Design a protein around this ligand. Structure first.
Ligand SMILES: CCCCCCCCCCCCCCCCCC(=O)OC[C@H](COP(=O)(O)OC[C@H](N)C(=O)O)OC(=O)CCCCCCCCCCCCCCCCC
Ligand SMILES: CCCCCCCC/C=C\CCCCCCCC(=O)O[C@@H](COC(=O)CCCCCCCCCCCCCCC)COP(=O)([O-])OCC[N+](C)(C)C
Ligand SMILES: CCOc1cc(CC(=O)N[C@@H](CC(C)C)c2ccccc2N2CCCCC2)ccc1C(=O)O
Ligand SMILES: Nc1ncnc2c1ncn2[C@@H]1O[C@H](COP(=O)(O)OP(=O)(O)OP(=O)(O)O)[C@@H](O)[C@H]1O
Lengths: 133, 292, 361, 164
């Protein structure tokens, strides 16, 4: 039972209490919006190739707009994930620093003193430098 | 699109597995944030109601008992030993019951306090926690020093701009070591005592005592040091008793603590024997037999 | 690529003091391996079997060992393949002869009425199963077909005789009869005639006698010699304490089988204190005998772990006389009742008796 | 050919594992020889404060100890090995606890003399500088003599009054 843990509860704690709502929503909004364009550019190409095989018109500007929308959305999605990942990483570390400092010395003596270190060096590194990617 | 499904399915499962392990790091970090303790507050007005700085040190213990694990298996039972305000008093215990319980109770570090304490006549639980430890000097067993500027080492919290600390630096102890650092007052530390005088911990408290207005002095045991180091502590104790008028030394070296007004010891979970003078300890040769 | 490891550096960060694994460590009380289960079914798995085909060389032993639904599949396949193997032969012979052509029968057909492979298949059924409808005869004008008719009959006769023999050895299977030989769930140790013994109850349910019954008992325990041997599963035979020494028993009523714990027994130093769950002890009981109906020998294997032993308990009476006959109330088959017994080992019991005998004399 | 020379150094070397493994050092563990050395080295006070005693993670990547304590572990490991020759190097200058040193000396004297195991105790121990045990003095990279301890007394300079 301990090993069997899909861990959807840990994702909620990260996003809600550390990321925010403006930045979290734009991350989800951009992802769905980016792949909606990715379908459209392929779909519009099929209609272009199928119909142009001799109403109808020349698709010399519409396909550019879908590509232009897709290229810009790639920049938006890439920035938002990394910017939000930065915000979570920085503010989580401040919360951990403000807790251990304002903590009783009884827990420090009882703890192996490596549990705090691991959750401070190894764990903070994975959250800071891997989750955004 | 059917061609690209093969690696979309692969990297969907692959990244998911790699994310779950990294999400476990969020689980473990957030578990430490669930250790909500160390309530820093005061159940009274802390601005002017408490004393600005305890000077008399008239702390008369009244049925206070300290136990760590949820007030279980206490090493003290209704500890009521009257210290001497306005004069030095050195109480040394053979075992850890005398000093371990006392040191925690002075600074409220003890997990449980069954009773109450009267700091300079004012209650302890109704006072700011930072001010409690700001004006109560104490030495430790092992030498502990950090790596940082000396001007931000002796009084980082006080941030006193007085140059008397530099004058005290070459006067309190290690006159040559001060010259060894070209910076002096503003000099930074060097590898945290990798090669430094053994009296650094005691010297640091000397600057802390003079700057932080530490009228009351606390002590602990010693691991290993020179014999003359104890003699230097004696001179500071005399100055502390003459000027600060409050001192409470706890150790297991009988002869050093003998030069004090009183002496006490708590044993077997309670108080063992209290003596108003210090020669009364020598009157009972049994306790001197245990010491040597 | 859409992988986080598309471009990574050579990384090494000191995870200082990576301690406190907090492992479950549940392997200590996982399970205690059994030598033979409560219903035979020896709980031993072999490894590194360097088979040289002897697994399948015993084909006729293997065919009997298979469950009945598997036997039906092999029975079906062995005959369907034989019918269909010769179906291709009859179809091809009539193809090569040229009577398959849908035309006037100017020639004399090799095998009459063979028009399609369906007719070739049906004629294969008729020959091998000896139905012989006779719509599809074998003509004399096909010297090749006469040979195949000989071959199909000999193969058909040979398959039947082999398949009948396998079924008869499966009808005489008596492993289902051995499942009606019952042993009590837990055996008991109690005093009988002033000497400690390891009692046990074994019963027969069916009314058909099992002839030449023979009960054996063995202790399975790790044994270290004075020379320092390491024998993992040492089997030491246990006498049945029969009045004539032999293992022969007469099973009508559920008999009590006990081992008198004399100085020559491996159980000579067993105390109730050391009868907990994880104790290196096991008693294997093997009841043999020939079933009176099929004449085939059987075995009923049961084992008693240490936690399945009950020190100082007695088996309740089971046989009670009725008006015209006796009566075995099987509801009380394994019921045990406490008995006044010493809590000391057999060696201490002998030693206490030895001291008392000296004091008396 | 050569033999397993025992060794200790001024800079103690420890294994980041259990203390018992840091003492036995990949050798058979018998409490008979074990207790005769830990009591001799007086490492019980260390194990009297550590949580798991010998199972505590001694060394780096774990529990940090004191300079004298590391010397106690290093000297204890040498004795348990039961080697035909034993070399020590400043176990008394680094840690100068009087009670600790002499209990091991009685254990050292008994086993080393009976088993005829060499013990080259390179140290500044003033108590046992003269004895029936041989001494060798060095200065400017040369050894004056390797014989009896009274040979130093046969010279004008007796190491500046021999700490009189
Ligand atoms: C990991 C999963 C592994 C699973 C392995 C098992 C696979 C099972 C397949 C399920 C379908 C099987 C249908 C069989 C129907 C007849 C058998 C039946 O009803 O059971 C009655 C039993 C078989 O029971 P059992 O407990 O398995 O016996 C084992 C036996 N006691 C032993 O171990 O020893 O049998 C008897 O007691 C024998 C009486 C036979 C008489 C009946 C005549 C039928 C002849 C065949 C008719 C069908 C012909 C179909 C031809 C088709 C051609 C196109
Ligand atoms: C369970 C089994 C019954 C199976 C019945 C036939 C299944 C195939 C059906 C089929 O088209 O068969 C065909 C043969 O087909 C072959 O010759 C197939 C040979 C395969 C070997 C048997 C299967 C393995 C049948 O066609 P034909 O024999 O050519 O018919 C003669 C033509 N004429 C009527 C014009 C003269
Ligand atoms: C754990 C690393 O062990 C592996 C090792 C390999 C061999 C290999 O060339 N790897 C790098 C490639 C180079 C350019 C970084 C890589 C890493 C991550 C994702 C994809 C890829 N490329 C793989 C080849 C096709 C293009 C994408 C494959 C797969 C694995 C694997 O995770 O099982
Ligand atoms: N794993 C195995 N599976 C089946 N038979 C085995 C196995 N190991 C040994 N045997 C059988 O044991 C006999 C010889 O055993 P042993 O291991 O003493 O000799 P060996 O050198 O392995 O034999 P060989 O060269 O004849 O196979 C042979 O009858 C061999 O078939």
């Amino acid at each position: 039972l301990h090993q069997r843990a899909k861990i959807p509860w840990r994702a909620c704690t990260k996003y809600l209490s550390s990321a925010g709502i403006l930045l979290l929503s734009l991350l989800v909004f951009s992802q769905l919006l980016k792949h909606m364009v990715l379908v459209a550019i392929d779909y519009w190409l099929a209609k272009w190739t199928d119909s142009a095989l001799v109403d109808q018109s020349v698709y010399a500007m519409v396909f550019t707009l879908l590509c232009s929308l897709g290229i810009v959305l790639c920049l938006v999605t890439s920035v938002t994930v990394e910017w939000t990942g930065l915000k979570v990483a920085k503010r989580l570390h401040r919360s951990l620093l403000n807790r251990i400092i304002l903590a009783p010395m009884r827990f420090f003596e009882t703890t192996p003193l490596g549990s705090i270190l691991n959750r401070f060096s190894s764990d903070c590194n994975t959250i800071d430098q891997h989750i955004p990617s | 699109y059917a061609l690209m499904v093969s690696n979309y399915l692969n990297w969907m499962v692959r990244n998911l597995a790699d994310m779950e392990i990294q999400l476990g790091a969020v689980k473990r970090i957030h578990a430490l944030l669930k250790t909500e303790a160390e309530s820093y507050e005061g159940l009274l007005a802390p601005s002017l109601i408490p004393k600005n700085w305890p000077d008399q040190g008239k702390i008369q213990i009244q049925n206070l008992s300290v136990r760590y694990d949820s007030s279980l298996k206490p090493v003290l039972k209704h500890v009521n030993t009257l210290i001497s305000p306005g004069q030095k008093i050195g109480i040394c215990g053979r075992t850890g019951s005398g000093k371990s319980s006392f040191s925690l109770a002075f600074f409220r570090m003890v997990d449980m306090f069954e009773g109450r304490i009267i700091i300079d006549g004012i209650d302890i639980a109704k006072l700011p926690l930072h001010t409690l430890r700001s004006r109560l000097s104490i030495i430790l067993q092992d030498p502990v020093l950090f790596s940082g500027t000396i001007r931000f080492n002796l009084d980082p919290e006080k941030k006193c701009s007085d140059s008397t600390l530099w004058e005290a630096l070459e006067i309190a102890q290690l006159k040559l070591v001060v010259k060894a650092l070209p910076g002096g007052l503003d000099a930074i530390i060097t590898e945290g005592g990798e090669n430094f005088s053994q009296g650094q911990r005691q010297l640091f408290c000397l600057a802390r005592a003079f700057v932080r207005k530490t009228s009351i002095f606390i002590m602990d045991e010693a691991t290993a040091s020179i014999d003359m180091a104890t003699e230097n502590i004696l001179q500071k104790v005399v100055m502390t008793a003459f000027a600060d008028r409050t001192v409470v030394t706890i150790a297991h070296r009988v002869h050093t603590i003998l030069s004090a007004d009183l002496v006490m010891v708590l044993k077997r979970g309670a108080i063992l024997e209290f003596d108003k003078p210090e020669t009364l300890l020598s009157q009972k040769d049994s306790v001197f037999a245990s010491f040597v | 690529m859409l992988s986080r490891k598309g471009i990574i550096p050579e990384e090494y960060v000191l995870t200082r003091l990576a301690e406190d694994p907090t492992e479950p460590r549940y392997r200590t009380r996982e399970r205690r391996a059994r030598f033979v289960s409560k219903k035979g079914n020896c709980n031993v798995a072999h490894k590194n079997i360097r088979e040289q085909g002897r697994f399948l060389q015993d084909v006729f032993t293997t065919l009997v060992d298979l469950k009945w639904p598997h036997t039906l599949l092999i029975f079906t396949m062995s005959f369907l393949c034989s019918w269909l193997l010769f179906a291709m032969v009859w179809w091809l012979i009539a193809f090569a002869h040229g009577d398959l052509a849908p035309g006037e029968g100017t020639n004399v057909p090799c095998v009459t009425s063979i028009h399609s492979f369906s007719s070739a298949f049906l004629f294969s059924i008729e020959v091998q199963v000896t139905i012989g409808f006779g719509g599809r005869m074998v003509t004399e004008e096909c010297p090749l077909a006469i040979l195949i008719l000989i071959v199909q009959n000999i193969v058909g006769l040979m398959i039947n005789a082999i398949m009948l023999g396998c079924i008869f050895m499966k009808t005489a299977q008596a492993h289902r009869r051995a499942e009606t030989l019952i042993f009590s769930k837990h055996a008991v140790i109690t005093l009988r005639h002033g000497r400690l013994c390891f009692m046990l109850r074994v019963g027969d349910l069916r009314k058909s006698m099992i002839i030449s019954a023979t009960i054996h008992m063995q202790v399975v325990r790790k044994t270290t010699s004075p020379e320092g041997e390491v024998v993992p599963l040492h089997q030491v035979d246990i006498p049945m304490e029969n009045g004539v020494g032999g293992n022969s028993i007469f099973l009508v009523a559920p008999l009590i089988i006990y081992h008198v714990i004399d100085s020559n027994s491996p159980l000579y130093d067993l105390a109730p204190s050391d009868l907990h769950h994880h104790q290196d002890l096991e008693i294997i009981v093997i009841l043999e005998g020939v079933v009176e109906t099929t004449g085939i020998t059987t075995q009923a294997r049961t084992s008693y772990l240490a936690d399945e032993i009950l020190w100082g308990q007695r088996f309740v009476p089971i046989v009670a006389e009725e008006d015209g006959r006796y009566s075995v109330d099987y509801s009380k088959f394994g019921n045990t009742v406490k008995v006044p017994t010493p809590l000391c080992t057999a060696r201490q019991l002998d030693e206490d008796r030895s001291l008392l005998d000296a004091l008396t004399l | 050919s050569r033999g397993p020379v025992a060794y200790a150094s001024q800079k103690p070397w420890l294994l980041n594992a259990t203390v018992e493994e840091n003492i036995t050092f990949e050798s058979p563990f018998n409490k008979q020889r074990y207790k005769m050395v830990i009591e001799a080295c007086s490492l019980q006070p260390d194990i009297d404060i550590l949580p798991h005693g010998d199972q505590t993670q001694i060394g780096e990547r774990g529990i940090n100890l004191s300079g004298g304590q590391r010397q106690r572990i290093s000297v204890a490991r040498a004795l348990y090995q039961q080697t035909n020759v034993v070399f020590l190097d400043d176990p008394f200058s680094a840690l100068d606890v009087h009670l600790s040193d002499h209990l091991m000396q009685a254990g050292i004297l008994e086993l080393l003399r009976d088993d005829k195991r060499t013990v080259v105790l390179v140290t500044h121990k003033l108590q046992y500088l003269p004895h029936a045990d041989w001494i060798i003095a060095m200065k400017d990279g040369t050894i004056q003599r390797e014989g009896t301890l009274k040979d130093f007394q046969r010279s004008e300079c007796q190491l500046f009054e021999h700490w009189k």
